[PDB]
């Protein structure tokens, strides 16, 4: 029983050493440096398209590679693929289990995935010889529900389930190759790196980690939030990422220097955050709150510069295009709106 | 007009897609959807196996009775936190609940201080007073009664409930348990709790569920046109 006490003591002094090392490399915050830059005055964005047709809540949305096509998943069991320019639809792929919580789009435009509450990730094919849409593979190796899945390539997919684990799959063989463990709470959000070599996942107890795909371990850990993490996205540079939360606060961490930089919190908001996505040049940090409206939080000034309040219910998914031409938001009223 | 030759053919496809979506939206909206809950040894398996059956993770059971399609989701394999995946069950007609009367003298496994009846009461209080289920009624089932009588004939009820003055008879013990279960309902003017004792005849349980669903439908129709 004494060896456990010794191990706890060594772990505690390692945490103290890590804290002193993180304190030593800090000299001045980011807000003290960026006080000589002219900030943006007002970002007034008006709605352009209103894609309608769903009949239940909307839980996910992903933009295509050409920034023209997008896919949205709803609770009624549909996986509609919209057209951004002409509002037309291209497919109406049904689902087996009408309890979905995520969606994705292949970088080559061939496949489309959709997880759900039945802890099974289904992969669909869109370029078949016939005119329908078939199920290419059904991956099932998780215990808890799946929360988010991103296509690492045309043959490899990563999933983040609720049983405190993350795993990398293989579409051709059907079995998982590497499993990432270490989280104490249910992982419920992740985002791949721009260069597709690493990825981060946000736990459910005030924790965020950084994983590597080739080795399959954790490199660094980030903490500082109060309640939990609810949405993560990378900075376009690849050396930073902004994490959501539930206690009305989103922060911006750094990968090279494992320390917080700045926080975007106001005394008017007391509601959680659902989705976070950066901009084309990393200057606007869009955030979707659950008080029926969004925000256009500035990235380097921590000052609000716009409000996209044209929604009825809580927003659940939003993401900027690849070329930075428009943004799309989806709320629980089954109404997508393309802002520009 | 401005559209090209094959651009007018792409618009006709979207119309058919929307028509097929709207046709299926009015079919899956005329069937009753009801959730199922309970403890591990609360006899949920017995409840789902005794009733009419026509059909890891969530399990759906479909059965029809008197021109009504019921969908019963059995969320029993979800070991994750119940807080995150509970807001997707906001739109539901009723909420079945299964408890065990005889599970009041057996202390939990790997635990020597708390009982199962207290855990059932706590879970029922957490379900009834949630911020999402502030309008949906709750059907409450009493599964085991014969074994409960055989247990209370030998062991008194004072071991589980420290405050009890009635005699050691089932006719008033069941009523006392029911009255203790109804008191854990803060929202007394927005939802009702239907108490039933599970019998060996499954037709009785099916009829009780059908009658509760009919009552809920009548109340919702009265609240629809603002008539009361």
């Amino acid at each position: 029983g004494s060896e456990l006490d010794q191990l706890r003591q060594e772990a505690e002094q390692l945490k103290n050493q890590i804290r002193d090392a993180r304190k030593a490399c800090a000299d001045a915050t980011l807000s003290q440096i960026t006080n000589n830059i002219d900030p943006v005055g007002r970002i007034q964005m008006r709605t352009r398209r209103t894609l309608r047709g769903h009949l239940a809540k909307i839980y996910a949305m992903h933009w295509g590679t050409d920034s023209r096509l997008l896919v949205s998943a709803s609770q009624d069991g549909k996986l509609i693929i919209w057209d951004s320019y002409t509002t037309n639809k291209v497919h109406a792929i049904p689902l087996r289990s009408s309890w979905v919580m995520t969606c994705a789009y292949a970088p080559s435009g061939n496949y489309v995935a959709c997880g759900g509450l039945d802890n099974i990730c289904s992969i669909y094919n869109l370029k078949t010889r016939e005119g329908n849409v078939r199920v290419s593979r059904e991956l099932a190796g998780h215990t808890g529900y799946l929360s988010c899945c991103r296509f690492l390539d045309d043959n490899q997919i990563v999933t983040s389930s609720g049983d405190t684990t993350c795993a990398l799959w293989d579409i051709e063989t059907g079995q998982q190759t590497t499993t990432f463990t270490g989280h104490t709470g249910d992982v419920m959000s992740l985002s791949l790196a721009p260069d597709t070599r690493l990825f981060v996942s946000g736990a459910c107890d005030a924790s965020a980690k950084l994983w590597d795909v080739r080795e399959g371990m954790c490199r660094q850990t980030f903490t500082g939030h109060e309640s939990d993490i609810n949405a993560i996205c990378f900075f376009p540079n690849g050396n930073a990422f902004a994490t959501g939360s539930d206690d009305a606060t989103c922060r911006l961490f750094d990968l090279r220097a494992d320390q917080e930089l700045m926080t975007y919190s106001h005394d008017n908001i007391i509601c959680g955050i659902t989705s976070v996505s950066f901009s084309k040049s990393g200057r606007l940090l869009l955030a979707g709150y659950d008080d029926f409206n969004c925000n256009v939080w500035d990235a380097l000034k921590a000052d609000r510069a716009g409000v996209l309040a044209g929604h009825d219910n809580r927003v659940s998914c939003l993401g900027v295009t690849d070329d930075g031409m428009a943004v799309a938001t989806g709320s629980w009223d089954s109404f997508l709106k393309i802002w520009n | 007009c401005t559209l090209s030759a094959e651009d007018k053919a792409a618009v006709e496809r979207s119309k058919m897609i929307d028509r097929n979506l709207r046709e299926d939206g009015e079919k899956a909206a005329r069937e009753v959807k009801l959730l199922l809950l309970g403890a591990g040894e609360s006899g949920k398996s017995t409840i789902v196996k005794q009733m009419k059956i026509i059909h890891t993770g969530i399990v759906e059971t479909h059965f029809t009775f008197k021109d009504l399609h019921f969908k019963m989701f059995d969320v029993g394999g979800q070991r994750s936190e119940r807080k995150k995946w509970i807001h997707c069950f906001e739109g539901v007609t009723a909420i079945i609940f299964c408890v065990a009367l005889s599970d009041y003298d057996l202390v939990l496994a790997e635990d020597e201080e708390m009982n199962r009846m207290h855990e059932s009461m706590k879970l029922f209080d957490s379900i009834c007073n949630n911020k999402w289920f502030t309008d949906t009624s709750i059907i409450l089932f009493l599964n085991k009664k014969d074994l409960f009588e055989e247990k209370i004939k030998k062991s008194p009820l004072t071991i589980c409930y420290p405050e009890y003055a009635g005699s050691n008879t089932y006719e008033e013990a069941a009523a006392y348990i029911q009255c203790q279960f109804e008191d854990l309902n803060k929202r007394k003017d927005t939802k009702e709790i239907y108490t039933h004792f599970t019998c060996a005849t499954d037709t009785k349980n099916v009829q009780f569920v059908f009658d509760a669903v009919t009552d809920v439908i009548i109340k919702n129709n009265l609240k629809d046109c603002g008539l009361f």
Partner: single-chain antibody, 232 residues
Framework: VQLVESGGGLVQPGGSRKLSCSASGFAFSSFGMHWVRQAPEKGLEWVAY????????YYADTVKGRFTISRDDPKNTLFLQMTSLRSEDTAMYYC??????????????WGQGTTLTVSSSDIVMTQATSSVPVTPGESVSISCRSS???????????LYWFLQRPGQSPQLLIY???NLASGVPDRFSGSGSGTAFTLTISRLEAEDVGVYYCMQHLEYPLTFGAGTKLEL
């Protein structure tokens, strides 16, 4: 995928038979179907068209109101019936499927075709030549000229191209402007400006010989070219 046709033979003017095709191997209820005539030793021309669900039906300007056409989804069969018959319809008939959405390839699978013998404003697409001699292992340039700028306000042209093999039905090569079809090698390529269109081939083998055709799909009265033949 498979497309077979039947119902052809020798008839007399005044009466006619009904042509039927059977489709099996895909979702026939979501595919638009065409009918392309093919005169013997001449050019092929469009005849009719049916959208998905019999919504829109377009006919040729020569046989408008004379032929009746209809689909059958539960049995997967497409019928064509002629009311009045003349001495010109003696030709080969091909029924070709086509689905229209963003990124699709119209009339990719043609079929086999059936024969028929009878005992007795619009865009004009012209070809540059009729038959040229060529040696294996040489780049060839085929040009097809139009009478109107096919470039639409969307930004993409609507000039389709395919190769007619000797003895069987043709197969698509590039559909919209230059996008290569599926299954054909990367040796074929095309380009243009909007009025004068051209097609180039990198390597010429002994397996790709026949008659080349260029199609105009900017307006629903479709029309083809005279057809240039490749001589080995």
């Amino acid at each position: 995928v498979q497309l077979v046709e039947s119902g052809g033979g020798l008839v007399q003017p005044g009466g006619s038979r009904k042509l039927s095709c059977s489709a099996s191997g895909f979702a026939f209820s979501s595919f638009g179907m065409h009918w392309v005539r093919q005169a013997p030793e001449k050019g092929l021309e469009w005849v009719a068209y049916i959208s998905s669900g019999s919504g829109t039906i377009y006919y040729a300007d020569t046989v408008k109101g004379r032929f009746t056409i209809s689909r059958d989804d539960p049995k997967n069969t497409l019928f064509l019936q002629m009311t009045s018959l003349r001495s010109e319809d003696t030709a080969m008939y091909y029924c070709v499927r086509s689905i229209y959405y963003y990124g699709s390839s119209p009339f990719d699978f043609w079929g086999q075709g059936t024969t028929l013998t009878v005992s007795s404003s619009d865009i004009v697409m012209t070809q540059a030549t009729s038959s040229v001699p060529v040696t294996p292992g040489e780049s060839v340039s085929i040009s097809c000229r139009s009478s109107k700028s096919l470039l639409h306000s969307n930004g993409n042209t609507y000039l389709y191209w395919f190769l007619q093999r000797p003895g069987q039905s043709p197969q698509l090569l590039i559909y919209r402007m230059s996008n290569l079809a599926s299954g054909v090698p990367d040796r074929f390529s095309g380009s243009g400006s909007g009025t004068a269109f051209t097609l180039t081939i990198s390597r010429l083998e002994a397996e790709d010989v026949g008659v080349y055709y260029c199609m105009q799909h900017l307006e629903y009265p479709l029309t083809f070219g005279a057809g240039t033949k490749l001589e080995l």
